[PDB]
Amino acid sequence: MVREFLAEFMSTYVMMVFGLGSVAHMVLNKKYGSYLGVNLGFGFGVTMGVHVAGRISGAHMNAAVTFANCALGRVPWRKFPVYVLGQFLGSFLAAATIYSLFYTAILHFSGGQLMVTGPVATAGIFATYLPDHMTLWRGFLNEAWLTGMLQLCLFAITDQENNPALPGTEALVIGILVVIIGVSLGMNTGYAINPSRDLPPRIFTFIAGWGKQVFSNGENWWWVPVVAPLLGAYLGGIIYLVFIGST
Amino acid sequence: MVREFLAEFMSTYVMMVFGLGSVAHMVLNKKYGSYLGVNLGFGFGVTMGVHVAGRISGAHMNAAVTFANCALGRVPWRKFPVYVLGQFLGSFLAAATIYSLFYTAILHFSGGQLMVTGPVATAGIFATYLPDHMTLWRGFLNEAWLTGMLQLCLFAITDQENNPALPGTEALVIGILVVIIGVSLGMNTGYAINPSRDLPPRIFTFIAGWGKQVFSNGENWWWVPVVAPLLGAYLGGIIYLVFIGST
Amino acid sequence: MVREFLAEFMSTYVMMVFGLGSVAHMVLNKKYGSYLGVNLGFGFGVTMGVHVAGRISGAHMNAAVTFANCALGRVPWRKFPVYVLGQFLGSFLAAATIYSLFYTAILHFSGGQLMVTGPVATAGIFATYLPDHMTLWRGFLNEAWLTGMLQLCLFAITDQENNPALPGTEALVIGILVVIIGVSLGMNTGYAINPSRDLPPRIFTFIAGWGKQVFSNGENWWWVPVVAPLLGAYLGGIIYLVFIGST
Amino acid sequence: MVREFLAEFMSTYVMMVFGLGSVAHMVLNKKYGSYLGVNLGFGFGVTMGVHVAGRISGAHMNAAVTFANCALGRVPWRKFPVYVLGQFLGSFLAAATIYSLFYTAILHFSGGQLMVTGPVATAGIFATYLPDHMTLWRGFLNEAWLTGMLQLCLFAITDQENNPALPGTEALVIGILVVIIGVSLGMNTGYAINPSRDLPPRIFTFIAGWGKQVFSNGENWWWVPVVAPLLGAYLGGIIYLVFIGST
């Protein structure tokens, strides 16, 4: 199963470099970054990852997507740890890549202080953090529902028995899906919708010196992007299957 | 006819979550929302709905589109109430979904006051409201003409006997059409162009506590996005058919 | 030849409604309009026009494109007046459509004064005007070169003997071409690149009451978007053919 | 080998006119230019170049892409000088084209002073310059890694034995790749990722009167966009091949 491991590693790495890089732009310089830039970077970063691993492993790049596909009987459970290990390694090294490419920008921006959110936050470049208007319950609800939207539309785009994207263009349409999840639903939680996108870079910032607060901030927010997308992806996939089965 | 009902429900729900979510971004935070974001959210939200229901029901997601297709002899009139019921239910629940996902943002933004438009409007997240420079007559004219543009281009994109989008890519091109209706024509009325997009979320805000003024504002504006698109879609479809019939 | 006349009329009308509408947004409200919006509106407005008329007339929507295709021996010269008449009529009525849809916005913006450019310009919604940093010679050079870029890339996108866009997707790629002509080259002259886009709406503003200065402004700028694109399109097409002929 | 020379010349010229034009917009007028505009201009400028030369020469438009393809045994080394000469000539003349089209804008902006970066920089319209927060080592690291990302994703998009873009749409997907390299990774060095994009326009500005400092600025930055992309493209291609070979 090293084939799927390496494909999930390579695709998740590529996707996360584009994703985290666009967030670094938005955080570090308003002249060269924006929330739309983040929407595009993660969105079409997913497109590139699909071209890398789509026909080798499926290019899940997302532990919740793998969980839903295994729990729904489309991928054997033995592949779940292989996929998630590949995703976690690729996303961790993507975080390390962005940190090194943007090192001087991060240091010039923060005055040398790796801040989680003081005068100048930088931990948010790598992982999601609850805005202060949000509660942890409503953050859980958002991450679950948004990952449900992801899984349902992922199925619709690739369902060969319904109305899929023309073969050879699914990577583009999937990318657009991730773009508008950010455009339409992302301001409330940073639309992590992906345990592999959120936890490995958070672990990196802890190792890189941002401190214990990358976990405890937002009322121990760190575990929600791990658990809520798992439930959301499964529920979104269930809803699509019940929908198609009824049609 | 439950097949088409469920497909219209699911596609309209998906489209409207992406649509209303992007408007919530634009209203509630200028850092994470913009009018272009709204153009993209509704536009490619339509793309996802087409993938859901396109080959089951046609993915009308729009009572005026269904009305024009029935009035032009392409869908039997018996399906009209089934389609519209599905669209209204999906769009109503999409409004309820956005309200719950953005609940704390709406409350933090408005100070707890569900305002239609006072110091901080929020009713406009869900339904269209006439800008003060507009008259109701010119608002009717806009909604009719814009829905006519929608129906004519919808026909052109999907006309297998003319120059359609390559099969398997129509969802993308249709989405782009809805993007630029917003980009080019949307500032005058909020380009409702869709009774199912406008009335069900307006009814939701009335039930949610925004009050009677969601209907009476803009000189009883509420009925125009219901009636004007019906006429516009029919006229736009008639013009395309007369155009092709003459060629 | 009424087939091609009606197709050029309908496609040019559709393209110009999307085009002029996006410029009206940019002029009249900075919250709902931008230069990128104009790039997208004209660009994907062209996409919709290609779906309307692409397989009936070729969807030239542009007198310079028709001139280059006739002068290069691809369309008989007898069709040239038929195409241009259709384009001029469609674009004129598109100008009339935008004026009526945006009438109250234009009146609220200008205080009731149809200004060419005083305190609040509105004539620029419909036709191009030289920025004050520009000379008429360099404006001629821009319109010629930009229309040359258009014609050369149009040929490359549709050349079945080279590397064309996949059939059924050319409308999208052509639209993107028009998007980036605006993004990359449009600030110097408004990238008219199209006599049918520029002169008919200029004539409309003269009839609508903007006055004689729609022609005499910019050192009699009005004739350059008519003549310079004709030369540019022909030269750009010649360069592509010499390029392919040499390969 | 004049076939490939002329194709590389024409495609690089087209790509660089769109690319440099969008940067001129961003530098010279904030109303009509933006960093996203630059991302789109270079990105879909690449799309047009691929349509020009994709099936004649491969539309490398990039000396590092040609170097990696020759060093990886996909193009004979005898074609390397032919490709690079064509790219350098096309990009040089594109710089000359932008300078002449934007001449009055450059003169009005700078007050007549061709400045590299004083009160009003304009040399950055044509070539990349290190931001002051950057070191030359980290600039080398960025240009190498970003060109590696380019080459790896280029291979993935066009790999007929893996999961490529549908034939006839690769130009679009490749363009999107170049868009998001700018969106996600471009603020640190201007993502030159291309010796043919950087050195010929830099040489033009030296000849045009910007002075010796176009080379010596940024601690002799000029050579890094020449050497670092060569190494990065080769390494990115090696990584993809080792990835696929292992799968």
From Swiss-Prot, chains A, B, C, D:
Please give the range of the full-length protein represented by this chain.
Answer: 33 to 279 of 342
**What is this protein's record name?**
Aquaporin-7
Known regulation of its activity is: Glycerol transport is regulated by pH, with the porin being permeable to glycerol at pH 7.4 but not at pH 5.5. Water permeability, however, is not influenced by pH. Inhibited by mercury ions.
**Which chain regions cross the lipid bilayer?**
5-22, 36-53, 80-100, 139-156, 169-185, 222-243
Q: How does it sit in the membrane?
A: Multi-pass membrane protein
Residues flagged as site, Important for permeability to glycerol? 103
Chief site of localization: membrane
State what this protein does. Aquaglyceroporins form homotetrameric transmembrane channels, with each monomer independently mediating glycerol and water transport across the plasma membrane along their osmotic gradient. Could also be permeable to urea. Mediates the efflux of glycerol, formed upon triglyceride hydrolysis, to avoid its accumulation in adipocytes and to make it available to other tissues. In the kidney, mediates the reabsorption of glycerol, preventing its loss in urine, again participating to energy homeostasis.
One GO biological-process annotation of the entry reads:
glycerol transmembrane transport
What does the subunit section of this Swiss-Prot or TrEMBL entry state? Answer: Homotetramer; each monomer provides an independent glycerol/water pore. Two homotetramers on opposing membranes can dimerize, forming a cell-cell junction. Interacts with PLIN1.
Query: What Gene Ontology terms describe what this protein does at the molecular function level?
Result: glycerol channel activity; urea transmembrane transporter activity; water channel activity
Domain free text: Aquaporins contain two tandem repeats each containing three membrane-spanning domains and a pore-forming loop with the signature motif Asn-Pro/Ala-Ala/Ser (NPA).
Q: Which reaction does it catalyse?
A: glycerol(in) = glycerol(out); H2O(in) = H2O(out); urea(in) = urea(out)
Q: Where is this motif: NPA 1?
A: 62-64
Name the intramembrane ranges: 58-71, 190-203
Tissue distribution is: Detected in the sperm head (at protein level). Detected in white adipose tissue.
Q: Where is this motif: NPA 2?
A: 194-196
User: According to UniProt, where does the site described as Selectivity filter lie?
Assistant: 42, 191, 197
Q: Which UniProt keywords apply?
A: Cell membrane, Cytoplasmic vesicle, Lipid droplet, Membrane, Phosphoprotein, Repeat, Transmembrane, Transmembrane helix, Transport
GO (cellular component) term, any one: cytoplasm
